[PDB]
Design a protein around this ligand. Structure first.
Ligand SMILES: N#Cc1cccc(C[C@@H](NS(=O)(=O)c2ccc3c(c2)CCNC3)C(=O)N2CCCC2)c1
Ligand SMILES: C[S@@+](CC[C@H](N)C(=O)[O-])C[C@H]1O[C@@H](n2cnc3c(N)ncnc32)[C@H](O)[C@@H]1O
Length: 246
């Protein structure tokens, strides 16, 4: 039988035999993460994940994938956030992210928590997901700017936010992208990502080879005019230490 592999620009894919309407509908469909090994296998309807069981892509034979279910009954489903509901299982971690990153005290003085690599990876590796509630740019701009620590732009219309109390891992740990701190010498970037559980979000992708236990950092997008005070102070301190030609 025929099998269709739909790769997203981020490297992840949807794989399965399509139905008679050319739809990704059935009991043996899978979402495969960018490592081409970690998979969520099971029931999908028109490419939407209804029941995706944690599995490993063991091999492929002429485009036909062979999956092995992972023990532990880790199950996922499409659960795209709204402006107020971040997730319906806030404490169920993403399996791909769980094996790549962890949260610990930041190496940046007084910067709270940070995001760290659990493993050695090459450049251009998806490490973490930036999921959150979906709000407009106008809502972010119009509201009290002190509520905008975790507001990451998705596109010209939408912002992804991780508001209180979900910015604490004890209340929300389905994704951990909101834990990466700012640096003017970052080792990661935010990039688009099409997630089977979270829907259209952003991810943290390495810019270079990263070693295990390095802090993962991204250059934040300000402008700068009305940037947070910690950013303005860091900009001046960073500039003062840059070596110059005499
Ligand atoms: N302008 C602005 C602005 C407002 C809030 C936050 C930010 C920084 C934010 N920059 S952003 O995603 O390009 C962004 C977010 C919100 C808004 C903008 C840009 C444009 C103005 N509308 C609101 C960022 O890089 N973050 C990294 C971790 C979380 C936030 C910029
Ligand atoms: C997206 S959160 C990153 C994780 C946050 N540190 C935490 O503990 O949950 C953004 C917040 O982290 C802090 N932060 C990020 N980068 C920083 C830096 N380079 N120096 C100081 N504080 C920083 C600021 O409080 C900012 O509002």
């Amino acid at each position: 039988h025929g099998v269709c592999w739909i790769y997203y620009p981020d490297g992840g894919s949807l794989v399965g035999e399509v139905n008679e309407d050319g739809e990704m509908t059935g009991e043996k469909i899978a979402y495969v993460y960018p490592d081409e090994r970690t998979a969520l296998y099971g029931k999908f309807i028109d490419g939407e994940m209804i029941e995706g069981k944690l599995a490993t892509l063991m091999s492929t034979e002429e485009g036909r994938p062979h999956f092995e279910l992972m023990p532990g009954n880790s199950v996922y489903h499409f659960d795209k956030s709204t402006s107020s509901c971040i997730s319906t299982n806030a404490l169920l971690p993403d399996p791909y992210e769980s094996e790549r990153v962890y949260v610990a005290e930041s190496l940046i003085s007084s910067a709270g928590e940070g995001l760290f690599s659990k493993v050695a990876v090459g450049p251009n590796t998806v490490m973490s997901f930036y999921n959150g509630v979906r709000i407009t740019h106008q809502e972010v701009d119009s509201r009290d700017w002190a509520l905008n620590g975790n507001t990451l732009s998705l596109d010209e219309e939408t912002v992804i936010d991780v508001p209180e109390p979900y910015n604490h891992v004890s209340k929300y740990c389905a994704s951990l992208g909101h834990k990466a701190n700012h640096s003017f010498t970052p080792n990661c970037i935010y990039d688009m990502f099409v997630h089977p559980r979270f829907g259209p979000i952003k991810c943290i992708r390495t810019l270079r080879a990263v070693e295990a236990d390095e802090e993962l950092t991204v250059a934040y997008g300000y402008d700068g005019p009305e940037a947070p005070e910690w950013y303005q102070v860091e900009l001046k301190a960073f500039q003062a230490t840059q070596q110059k030609h005499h």
